[PDB]
Amino acid sequence: NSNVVTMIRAGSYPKVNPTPTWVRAIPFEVSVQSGIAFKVPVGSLFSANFRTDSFTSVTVMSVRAWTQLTPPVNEYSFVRLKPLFKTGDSTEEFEGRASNINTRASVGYRIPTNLRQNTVAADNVCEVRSNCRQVALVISCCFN
Amino acid sequence: NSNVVTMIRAGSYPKVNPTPTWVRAIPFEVSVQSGIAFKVPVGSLFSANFRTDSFTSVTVMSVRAWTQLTPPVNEYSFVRLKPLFKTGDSTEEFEGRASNINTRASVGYRIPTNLRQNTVAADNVCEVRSNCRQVALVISCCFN
Amino acid sequence: NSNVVTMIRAGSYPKVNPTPTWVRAIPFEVSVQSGIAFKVPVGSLFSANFRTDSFTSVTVMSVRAWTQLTPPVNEYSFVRLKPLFKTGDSTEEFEGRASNINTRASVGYRIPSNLRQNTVAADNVCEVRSNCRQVALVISCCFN
Amino acid sequence: SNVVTMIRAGSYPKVNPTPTWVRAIPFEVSVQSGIAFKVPVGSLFSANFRTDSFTSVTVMSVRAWTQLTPPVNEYSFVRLKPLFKTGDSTEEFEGRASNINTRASVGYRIPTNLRQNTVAADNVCEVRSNCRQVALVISCCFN
Amino acid sequence: NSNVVTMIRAGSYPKVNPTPTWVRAIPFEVSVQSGIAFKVPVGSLFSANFRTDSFTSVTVMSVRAWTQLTPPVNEYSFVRLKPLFKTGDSTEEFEGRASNINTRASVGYRIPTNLRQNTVAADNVCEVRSNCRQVALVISCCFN
Amino acid sequence: NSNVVTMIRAGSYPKVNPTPTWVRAIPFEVSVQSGIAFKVPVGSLFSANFRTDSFTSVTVMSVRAWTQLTPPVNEYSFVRLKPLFKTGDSTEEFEGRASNINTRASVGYRIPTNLRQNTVAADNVCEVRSNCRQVALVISCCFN
Amino acid sequence: NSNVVTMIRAGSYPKVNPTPTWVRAIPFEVSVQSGIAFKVPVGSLFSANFRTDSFTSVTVMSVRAWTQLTPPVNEYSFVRLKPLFKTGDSTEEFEGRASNINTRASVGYRIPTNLRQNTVAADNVCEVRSNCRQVALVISCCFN
Amino acid sequence: KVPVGSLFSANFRTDSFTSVTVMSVRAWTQLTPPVNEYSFVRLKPLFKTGDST
RNA sequence: AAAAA
RNA sequence: AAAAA
RNA sequence: AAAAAAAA
RNA sequence: AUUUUUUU
RNA sequence: UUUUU
RNA sequence: UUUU
RNA sequence: AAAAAAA
RNA sequence: AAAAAA
RNA sequence: UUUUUUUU
RNA sequence: UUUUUUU
RNA sequence: UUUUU
RNA sequence: UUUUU
Ligand SMILES: [Cl-]
Ligand SMILES: [Cl-]
Ligand SMILES: [Cl-]
Ligand SMILES: [Mg+2]
C-alpha cells in the first residue's frame, strides 16, 4: 500500500451538503410509573448527548424497549408499547415479559413504510407501561 | 518421537534479539466512582505481575471491560468506554448494559491500524464509566 | 481497511492468565577455559536482560553453541556439548569444528520430548569444552 | 439360545491382577482469602475413589470450580498454578464468573512430557480464590 | 505437540462419579479335592489384591479354568465347570482335558445376557472338578 | 561394483561425536527367591559384557522376563513384573505363566514416552517375582 | 501412544547377542612431520574414548582426512592418503589441497567391498602426508 | 542515537526534505572488531510515541 | 446405541 | 515413529 | 508448537 | 485412534 | 547396510 | 570402475 | 529503469 | 470502510 | 498477523 | 508468470 | 441513503 | 446355542 501522500486529479466542483442526514439508534431512558403510561417525547432524540441537537425532525423506523430497574417484589418485569402517530394514535399494546425476575423485559415494534413521516420535538413516539420505575429505549430512526 | 538426544548440524551464528516483542492481553482492575470517569493509565500494563516490567512502550489494539462488582440496588450493571489518543481524544461512549442484575456488563472497542502507535506509562488508554465500583479490563496490546 | 474505532460486542468474561508461558531463543555467552568442562547453569536463562526475571523454571528443547573468540595460534576453533539431566547425565560429546581459523565453530543437540522436563536455576544444562575462551549459546526453551 | 455356552480356551494367558485405571476424580479443598493452597496428590488415593491401592499417578489435566459463594458484591474467581517436581510453574490460569450466583471455572492441561508419576507427598497445583471451598476434577492415570 | 501447560476453557461443573464401574479379568486359584466338587465363592473376586475391595457386587460375564498343578501319575489333566445361579443352578459339566501330561487342561463357559445379574460374596460362581489339586480361574466380570 | 579404492571429494570438516548413543537389547539373569520380590538394578546394564561400561545413564523403553530355571515340583512356571520409577513406583504386577511345566514363563511391559527418562546405576527398573530360582531379562533401552 | 505402562504378551525366549556389532564414524587426530609419511594404526580406533575398547577387530569402509593445524607460511594446506592392505599396500596418493590458506585441506577414499576384511590393532589403515603438523581423520568402519 | 537529520543532506539530494517516513533500517559494521573478537551490532527502534526495548 | 476418561 | 555415514 | 484478543 | 476386558 | 518392538 |  | 524479491 | 436494521 | 520450528 | 510505491 | 469519487 | 470339527 501507499506510505506517502498521493495526488488526486479532482475535476469540477461537486454537489455538496454541509448538513446531511444520519440514520441512528438512540439509547435513552424514560421514567415510567406503576399503572401509568408515559408518552415518549420525540424531543428526547434531539440532544447534544447524541450529536443530534442540529436536527429538528426525525423519521422513526423501529422502537425497542427494555426495563431499566428491578420489578416490584414477587413480580416479574414487563413492558408495553403503544404506537402514537399524528394522523391517529394506535391501540396496540406490544407487551414483553421477563421469565426471570433478575432479567430485563423487552419488546419492540416496527413502523411500516407508509407510516414513516417526520416528527418534531412536540410530537410523541409511543406510550410506555411497566411495573419498573425506568425503561431503557433504543429507537432506530433517520434524522434530517 | 525420538528417545535420545540428537546432534544439530548448526551453521553460521544467527540473528538474535535478547529483548523481543510480546503480544498480550492484560487482565487488571480499576476503581470507579459514581458519576465520574476514571482515566486508565498505560502504566498499569507494565508490571512484574504480567511479566511486562521490562517494557516501556506498548501498542494497544483492542480494549474490553467487565463490571467487577455488583451494581447499586434496583439497578442493572453498565459500563462505558471513551477511547483516548495522544493525537486527539475521542468522544465515543461505547456502552454495555447487563440484561440480568446478577450478570456483568461488557463492552469493548477496537483500535484501527492507522491509530496503533506506542504509548508510554504517562499516557492513558481510555475513560471508564460504570455504576459499579470496580471494572475488569482485558487490554489486547503489543508490548515492544 | 478501517479508519476509526469500532464497538466490540463483548460477552462473558473470558479465561485470563496474567503470567503466561513463552517460547524463546535465549542468547548468552560463557567463559570457557582450555581443557576444562564448564557446566552451564540454568540460572543464566532467568534474567531481566531477557525479560525472563519473572520465571523460575524452564523446559529446554535444544541447545546450540558458537565459539565467541578466536582459537589459539595455528589451530581451528572447536566446541563440544555434553547434555546433562537431573535423571541422569549423558556422556555424548557433540563436537563441531571450523574449517577456517577465522570462522566460528558450531554444534547443537535436541532434547527429546521424553526428556523435556523443567529445570530450575540451581540445575545445569550441559557441559561446554572449547579451545576458545568464550562460547556463545542460543538455547531454544519454553519458559513457564 | 438364551442359555450358557462353552468357550474353547487355549493356553493360559498373560494376566495382571492390579492393572492401571484412567479416572476423573472429583474432590474439594478448603481455601483461604489471599492465600494459595497447595493441593496434595495424596487426595487422589482414597477408598472413596476405589484408589486406596494405588501409590502413584500420572496427571493429565486439572479443572477447578468454586464450591461456595463469593464475598458480598464480588464475583467468583479461581486461579491455578501448576506445580512440578522438576520445577514449579508461575502461570496463574484464572477463570471468573460473569454471574455472582454462578461458579468460576478454569483448568490446565499437562503436556505429554511433564506427565510423570507423583506420590502422595507431591503437590499438583496451587489454588487461589475468593470462595472458601473450590471443587476439583482431575483427569489422571493411576498405576 | 505442546511442550508446556495450556489453558482449559472449562465451563459448567460436569456430571461426576467418584465410585465408577470396572470391567476386569480376575486371576485367582482355588484348591480342589479328588472326586469332590468345589463351589467357587464370589468373595474371591472382592479383594485388595485386585483393587476391588471397594465393590460389594459383581456381574460375571465368563469363566475360564486352567489346572494349576500336575495331574496324578499316569493320567492326563482334566477340569470340569458347572455353572451356578441363584435363580437355578445348571447341571452342565464343561470339561476340558489335556492332550499332554505336562500341559494344563483348559475349559470355559460364557454367561448369556439374560443371565448377567449381580452376585455377592456369599454366592457361588460354579463348581470345579479336577484330578489336579489346584485350579486357576480367570473370571471376566463387571464390577459395580 | 567397484573393485579398487575410490577417491572421496570431501568438503568441510563435519560435526562429529566420539561417544554417541546406542539402542540395545540387553540380556542378563537375576537370582530370585520364593515369595520375595527382587529389585532389578539399572547398574547391571552398564558392563563390559554388553559393551556398555562407558555409559552412565540409560533410557529404558521396555522390559521382558523369562524363567531361567525349572519351577518347584508339580508347579508351573510363573513370573511377575512391577515397574519402578523415581517419580513414583507402580503397583502393576504384570504376570505370565507357563502352560507346560517344561516350558518357561514369559511376561513384559512397555514404558510410555512421557515416562521415558534417564536412569543411573543407583536406580531400579522393576521388581521380579517367580517360583523359579532365576529369571532371564531382556531390556530394550537407549544408552546415552 | 500411551500414558501408562502396558503389558507385552511375550512369547518364547528369542535369539540374543550381548556384544553386537557397531557401524561407526570415528574421529581422531594424528601428528605428522613435514616430508615424512605417517602410518595410521588401526589400534587408535579401539579406545574407551570411542566406546570401542571391547572390540579387537574392525572392518574399515572409508577414510577421510582434514588438516588440523595451519600450514607453513606462504603455503596452502594439503593432505595425501595412501591406502594400506594386509594382502598388499597401494601406491595411490589421494590428495586434496585448500584454495584458501585459512581453510582446511580435505580428501578421502572408499574401500571396495572385496577389500572389506577385518583389521586388528596391529595393522595400519593408510599413510598420511601433509605440510601441517596434525591431521584430523574420520573413519567410517564396522566394529565387530 | 541515530539522528533523522543525517538523512537530509546535499550528498543524498535530500536537503529539500524536512520530514521522512522510515520503513526499515539495516546496519553493517564498517571497521574491524577488536582483537580475537567477532563483529556484532545491535539496533533499538526509537519512536516519538514510544521507544522500543 | 461395549466399559472409564 | 526411533538409531548410526 | 506457543498463555493471551478474537472467530457460523 | 488413551486405558481394561472380549477379540483372526 | 547395522541395532532395536 | 580411475581421473579435472 | 528504481523500494522490498525475482526461485 | 463508517451509523443503523435484517 | 508477534516468538520459537522441520531433509540443499 | 506472482507482484506492490510518486512520473 | 446520505457523504467523499 | 449347545454339540461333533
Ligand atoms: Cl519499551
Ligand atoms: Cl549467544
Ligand atoms: Cl554408517
Ligand atoms: Mg569454511
Ligand SMILES: [Mg+2]
Ligand atoms: Mg462454589
Ligand SMILES: [Mg+2]
Ligand atoms: Mg568480524
